[PDB]
Amino acid sequence: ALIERIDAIIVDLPTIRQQQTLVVLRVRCSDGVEGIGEATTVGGLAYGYESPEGIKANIDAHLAPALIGLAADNINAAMLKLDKLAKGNTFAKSGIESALLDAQGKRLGLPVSELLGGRVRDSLEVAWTLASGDTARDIAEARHMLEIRRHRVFKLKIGANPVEQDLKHVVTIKRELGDSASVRVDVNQYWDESQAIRACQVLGDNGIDLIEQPISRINRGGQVRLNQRTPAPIMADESIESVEDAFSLAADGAASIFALKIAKNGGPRAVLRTAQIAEAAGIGLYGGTMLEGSIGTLASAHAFLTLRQLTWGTELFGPLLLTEEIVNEPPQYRDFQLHIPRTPGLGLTLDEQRLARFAR
Amino acid sequence: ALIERIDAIIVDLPTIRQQQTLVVLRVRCSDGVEGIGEATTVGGLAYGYESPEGIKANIDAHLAPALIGLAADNINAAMLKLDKLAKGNTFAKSGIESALLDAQGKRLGLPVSELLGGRVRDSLEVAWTLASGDTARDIAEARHMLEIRRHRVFKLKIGANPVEQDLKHVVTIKRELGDSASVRVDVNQYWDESQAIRACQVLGDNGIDLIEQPISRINRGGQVRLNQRTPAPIMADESIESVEDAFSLAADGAASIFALKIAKNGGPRAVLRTAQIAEAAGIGLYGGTMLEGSIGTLASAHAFLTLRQLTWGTELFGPLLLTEEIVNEPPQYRDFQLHIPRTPGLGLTLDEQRLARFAR
Amino acid sequence: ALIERIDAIIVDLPTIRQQQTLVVLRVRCSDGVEGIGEATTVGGLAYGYESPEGIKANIDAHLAPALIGLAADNINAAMLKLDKLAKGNTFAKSGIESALLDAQGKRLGLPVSELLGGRVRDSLEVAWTLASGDTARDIAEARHMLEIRRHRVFKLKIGANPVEQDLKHVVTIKRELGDSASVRVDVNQYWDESQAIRACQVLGDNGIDLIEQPISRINRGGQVRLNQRTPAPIMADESIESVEDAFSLAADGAASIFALKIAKNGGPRAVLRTAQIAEAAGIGLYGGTMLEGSIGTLASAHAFLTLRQLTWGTELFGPLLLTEEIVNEPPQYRDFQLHIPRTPGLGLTLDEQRLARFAR
Amino acid sequence: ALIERIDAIIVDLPTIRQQQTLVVLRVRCSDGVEGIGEATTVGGLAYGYESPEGIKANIDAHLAPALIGLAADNINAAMLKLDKLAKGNTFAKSGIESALLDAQGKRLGLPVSELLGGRVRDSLEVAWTLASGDTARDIAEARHMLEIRRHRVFKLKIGANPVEQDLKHVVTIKRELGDSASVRVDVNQYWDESQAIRACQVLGDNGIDLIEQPISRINRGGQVRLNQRTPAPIMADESIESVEDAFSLAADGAASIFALKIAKNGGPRAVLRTAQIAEAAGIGLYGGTMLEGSIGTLASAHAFLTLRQLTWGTELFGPLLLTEEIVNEPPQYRDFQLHIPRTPGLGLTLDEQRLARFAR
Ligand SMILES: [Mn+2]
Ligand SMILES: [Mn+2]
Ligand SMILES: [Mn+2]
Ligand SMILES: [Mn+2]
């Protein structure tokens, strides 16, 4: 089986909040097997180097031509080849690897998690981002998610308003939910070290379980200092833009927790390298997302199932934000977790009609 | 006097809780003197590289043949020879050295502690592990041990349940006992650094005297960071698997207290090297155990009696967990301490009948 | 397919030099497929914690019972389970993983290298150890190996004689061979830092390509200092006794090259974690061996074929030292390299007659 | 057996060069056994805190009164007591411990080396200091010592003349002796780091085997820097004025070799602690001296016989410098080594007549 064609399709899907743009990859092999992958980001170029437009242009012009003709069953050789011709471009690489893994899983009749070694679990805990902006509404949404047993871990995005306004908001939510939920924050690099010093103390003293990426990745020393002084543990996300960054942060002691994202590392196998480095250093894990649809979510999930331990769970709730999907199989969210079947590949198939309807 | 025969016998003894497996060593010398030693571990291979089965196989096939014929009175030459042919195998080496020291003590008419230089005390404070799992039962067992004046220092094994569940358990016990007892914990490498950050703070703020091995030995930086930030002092145990590890941790500032175990270092003389290194660095001491019976307990005790100071006492309570013993002389636990006589060798003799009864 | 039986057989084979002891593992699965593995060391306990006797005792008593009944096709779950019940025991784990990988390769019809991701090459460069002790003989053996195009990279084991005697020996060999061969040394931890200082300079100034493990693993600082001052690069071998050690050495900058041994890490998949860590740090690779027969050699080789780059080649020449083998398929050494076929599993089958003949 | 009396006698003996002052200790025990020790220095207060006069005054007024009445057979308890009442005073402590060890050896019928664990050798290599000041004479004395097979390792004391004058002297001696002798230097803290930089390079490039204490102990950073840059290894001597200093230097990486002196550490047992620390760090050893007579030399020797390895030999040639002695048994210097018998204690007895003749 050889790789015959690779198609990168930009799809705009409507959300429950506005749209979300996905780059769906379809890799057709000579044995008739097709693999599907996903390369998705948030806000064009605001949360990464790659935009949907940039991802497609590079796949069509550089990445895809390098793979047509190669053995579809030798994923390592294919991905190493891409590293030799292309610096970075991890989101694009992630979609490509996800698709090759899907095709290979269907070919051998095994779930991607088994291709990656074997799963140690069948479900993953999923956190939920309370994003209404209104404290009263957030507490209400949280009480609801707990009621229907969908989520018991909540994430708050802060950093866009005055520090003291965001702190009041977060402390109020943890105060009202109490021990019934785990409350965490994500500052998305918005604070400088001088603002984080007091903010991390207040949050830590008021029961916040972890503080995700409080300051910018450019401030390495600041990350090391905050890792040693904050009452609540520091998780790195944006600081990891490659597997080598993970080693660097580990060697430096810049964070006690690493967020694992297939898009930021280069695919399901790449994310496992990063996880392995963290494991060898004793750094805790968390399954992150770039708000992918079901393809990217399942591609992430299949890798996370092989991990010994994910101390802080995951946030694979991307499909729950989309009103319409492009696959036929809806993901199973039940009892605070996402459940992954033992079907071949990623266990998903495209809905040709909805795909054609939402493809731009 | 030459070494003529060395026998390694696996013995399964019943406990008050299940069984405990010991490897009893018998070294017979040409002058008719016999020395007895012990090499014991907990849970097969779960708490160390050496299992009872592995210990015996290596003694019979490699270690013992190297000693038959050598002067029984030159312990240094014998132990150095073993280091030259065998990497690691500290538990096995510990049993062998204990036996040679016992034989040499009987030969010269001196207690092993005197062979090791001279004792500065005749008794050692002994801590007790509250292991029922039930908080109410633990407090009750603790009140009892205080009542009969057997123990006033208590150790709790945590880390197998959710962090917050274990913290509640430990804080409740310290709350109810108050200043009448010293309460300490042992996490047995079960937490990662991200979990330990908050856990060490809560424990330290609630009167826990020390936190033993909170995180894995693989996380060196984490140990150094926790040593600088935890309100309660950090004790290293599993991180020491040799005398050289002790130097490394001392040079790094990875712990302010070292647990001393003859099995983890290579014998009574080896444990003294580790203690000496700690002393030269200003690191506090604690007499640890691998739940040995009376032979291994006394072998440890004889070395600990020579120490200038053991700030945190010891936990030489192993014989109290066994319902049956293989020696004739029961250890004296009285007034919160273990008392060591001034009899030759380890001051113990085998009970041939019980030995034959429990030997597998 | 479930794991039904696991047999650990000690086999003594004759060498061209004396014997070599192997522990052959046979794992039988419920679908009729059998996987074979190997756990071998050099000199009993002289080059590691595990002896052939210790390896078998632990497999029979602890490791094997934990696997009987588990899915043979979920290697990750099986190996993670072993890490949970057994500390260390990497040689034993390496044999077990090699066997599971072999069985799984035969089951799916793929070579182990493909199970591990996909090979990027079909052959590996192989170095040869000149071990006659006589300089004149060594040069002769080297000229011969170059003549028949079997080896062009030579390794010298030094450290057992006076420093200046070993230096003369090594310099003479490089002097006479010139640019036709690559000459490297291995000191096997025999020098202390004070001896290595001058020795590394002389060797480096006289064309020796690399210096393998000059000083003991206990001297970490010394390794860091030698890594910064020696004219010839420093390779770590004995310092790596686990994947976590590799991270530590990388973070410390203790060596610019890592020797990769499946036995020291825990198996083919484990050695890949170590290699990944090195790659993320920019550390060069070398395929090492513990003088394994064809099973262990091929198990190592299949993992090394997936690596992007092995700057310093390999030393997979173990089968060339044995006069008799226990497999039917002889390895192909041709044109300075070892060639690996694309047959299922490790591509080897046992010779039942020679096995029964050499099994102790 | 209790300690009844301790006498500190100042004795002035004539040398082959001038006199050498010794402080002979005689400890009489209630069982009739007497132990002899020695506390000696060079040049009053020029090479240490303690002078012969200061040593005696402190023994008579503070140290001795603290021991009268204690068990003579519990050396550990006695020495620990002294550490509790007296800061430093290592030379004095060294004499006292040597005497207690001698008495205890005679009491049990064992050589001190056996009390310390057991010897691994019966002789020690001895270096010789060429001190005539004249290059031509030094070469001649060296050729002679090689001829009669007394010494093959030579030490040169430099630093009192202009750097370039001393360098010429040392290089000429190594040039003329060639590979027949090992040439080493001792700068006795005389250079500052700026002078040592070039001097260490010249010496290292011209075959000098090691450079002993080139700069002052006050310059720690300078020692660390020279340890990393000098072509020839750096040995610490004056930097060690206690066992704790040894740990500090080891942790810092200030030297690759440690000189072991009983007088600088506190006695035979104390020097073993220092040696153990070095061993755990991978630092090479050398048996040093303070130009002691036979009592102090043998007291040092008995401890050095227990050491696994002394890479750079010893310099126990003190008795060869004295024309008259105060003991009856002359030391055996033969075939480049000092030979130690297996007689009880230090194996020496006082010559009452010569003692009374040279006692001041
Ligand atoms: Mn984030
Ligand atoms: Mn412990
Ligand atoms: Mn090697
Ligand atoms: Mn000196």
Swiss-Prot record, chains A, B, C, D:
InterPro entries: Chloromuconate_cycloisomerase, Enolase-like_C_sf, Enolase-like_N, Enolase_C-like, Mandel_Rmase/mucon_lact_enz_CS, Mandelate_racemase_C, Mandelate_racemase_N_dom
Residues the record marks as active site: 157 (proton acceptor), 315 (proton donor)
Enzyme class: isomerase
GO molecular function: chloromuconate cycloisomerase activity; manganese ion binding; muconate cycloisomerase activity
Keywords associated with the record: Aromatic hydrocarbons catabolism, Isomerase, Manganese, Metal-binding
Residues that hold Mn(2+) according to the record: 186, 212, 237
Keyword S-adenosyl-L-methionine in record: no
Pathway: Aromatic compound metabolism; beta-ketoadipate pathway; 5-oxo-4,5-dihydro-2-furylacetate from catechol: step 2/3
GO biological process annotation, one example: beta-ketoadipate pathway
EC id: 5.5.1.1
Pfam families to which the protein is assigned, alphabetical: MR_MLE_C, MR_MLE_N
The protein's required cofactors: Mn(2+)
Catalytic activity: (S)-muconolactone = cis,cis-muconate + H(+)
UniProt cross-references to PROSITE patterns, sorted A to Z: MR_MLE_1 (PS00908), MR_MLE_2 (PS00909)
Subunit structure: Homooctamer.
NCBIfam families per UniProt: mucon_cyclo
Family: Belongs to the mandelate racemase/muconate lactonizing enzyme family.
Function: Catalyzes a syn cycloisomerization.
Protein name stated in the entry: Muconate cycloisomerase 1
Organism: Pseudomonas putida
Organism phylogeny: Bacteria, Pseudomonadati, Pseudomonadota, Gammaproteobacteria, Pseudomonadales
